[PDB]
Amino acid sequence: DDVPPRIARAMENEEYWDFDIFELEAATHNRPLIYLGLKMFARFGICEFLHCSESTLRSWLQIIEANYHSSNPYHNSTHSADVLHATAYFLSKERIKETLDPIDEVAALIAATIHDVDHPGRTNSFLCNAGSELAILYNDTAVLESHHAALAFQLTTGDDKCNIFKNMERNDYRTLRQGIIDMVLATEMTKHFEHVNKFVNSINKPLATLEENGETDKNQEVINTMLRTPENRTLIKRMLIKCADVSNPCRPLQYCIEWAARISEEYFSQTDEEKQQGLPVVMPVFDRNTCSIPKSQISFIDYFITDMFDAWDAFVDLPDLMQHLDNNFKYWKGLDEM
């Protein structure tokens, strides 16, 4: 409640898409997740659903945020706060509000908080090739993604004061647990095109077919009944977490460039380490001495972003995001100047 002025001013227009997440980072002193978490969890009314106190949530938001590495350029508490902000925005839209249930809204916002917890600034491929402690632990299969979720529940349940899932029912926790685990694991990029195709075939194409009839009262109930099933809700949740995770190209141009520079720096550190240690170079194009950042961002957007957000926009209707995507894409094209 009693938040100091600079941090309180940074979180004024937090419902809006245009949000100064880096002012919050500077204001909070690399602690943006706890302050943004407090307001976001309260606004939805998550501790009323979970039956937790304010002090239980503060201890929970603290211990996860401590395990986020400040040394990492991109994968830190500020990134998870940006994803949490993106998550809440998509949940607040009319398509997602009317489709999803309150249990799903809680699972999404919790998942966004923990999805990259204890990131080593490195990819899965690096850890498998290096023979890391977690690579051997998870058998070179969803190494980081399983570690993020597994460690998050170890921190939450393992300590009594940190446990936000203390007063819940037996059935309510397991459905919530299965929901959070699935959304965190869905962020793995090897299954990127799998999660995009399953979204288009099961949601968008049926919804496109049903919309041919019109806006009749009986037909809207069929659109409701079809989307609101457990299978399709999960596919919407898998798509929502994926989009919010890589929503930085759809931000305002200042933030887009900042997110681009940070993730690029995190690769150059990895590429320098792989050369010195004598590991196989899994990311050859992302080297500080040869990489074009503008040209790299164009390749990333064309491969991952453009087709995914096309599907997500067609479903949810996101005119601000797709307009920013067009403005940022053309800016990266303009920086060649040769």
Ligand X SMILES: Nc1nc(Cl)nc2c1ncn2[C@@H]1O[C@H](CO)[C@@H](O)[C@@H]1F
Amino acid at 240: L
List, comma-separated, the residues after which the chain is broken, a break being a C to N distance over 2.5 A; otherwise answer none.
Answer: none
Alpha-carbon gap, residue 171 to 54, rounded angstroms:
24
Nearer to Mg ion, 187 or 248 (CB): 187
Binding residues for Zn ion, rule CB under 5 A, total 2
Could you identify the residue written with the tokens 């809440």?
A: 88
Amino acid at 230: P
Positions in 168-197 near Mg ion (CB under 5 A): 187
Q: Quote the radius of gyration of the chain (alpha carbons, Å).
A: 20
Alpha-carbon gap, residue 177 to 171, rounded angstroms:
10
116 binds Zn ion (CB under 5 A): yes
Positions in 58-117 near ligand X (CB under 6 A): 74
248 binds ligand X (CB under 6 A): yes
Among 78, 80, 156, 187, binds ligand X (CB under 6 A): 187
Kindly state the smallest distance separating residue 144's Cβ from Mg ion, in Å: 6
Q: Which of 29, 51, 69, 75 is catalytic?
A: 75
Q: Is 182 labeled as ligand-binding?
A: no
Question: Is 148 a residue of the active site?
Answer: no
245 binds ligand X (CB under 6 A): yes
Among 17, 300, 307, 322, binds ligand X (CB under 6 A): 300
Among 296, 306, 310, 313, binds ligand X (CB under 6 A): 296
| CA dist 196 → 64, 203, 204, 333 (Å) | 29, 11, 11, 26
Kindly state the smallest distance separating residue 150's Cβ from ligand X, in Å: 18
Kindly state the smallest distance separating residue 246's Cβ from ligand X, in Å: 5
Return the half-sphere exposure (C-beta side, CA atoms, 13 A cut-off) of residue 171.
0
Alpha-carbon gap, residue 55 to 258, rounded angstroms:
34
Query: Which residues contribute to the annotated binding site for a divalent metal cation?
Result: 79, 115-116, 245
Residues that bind Zn ion (CB under 5 A): 116, 245
- Residues with a catalytic annotation lie at 75
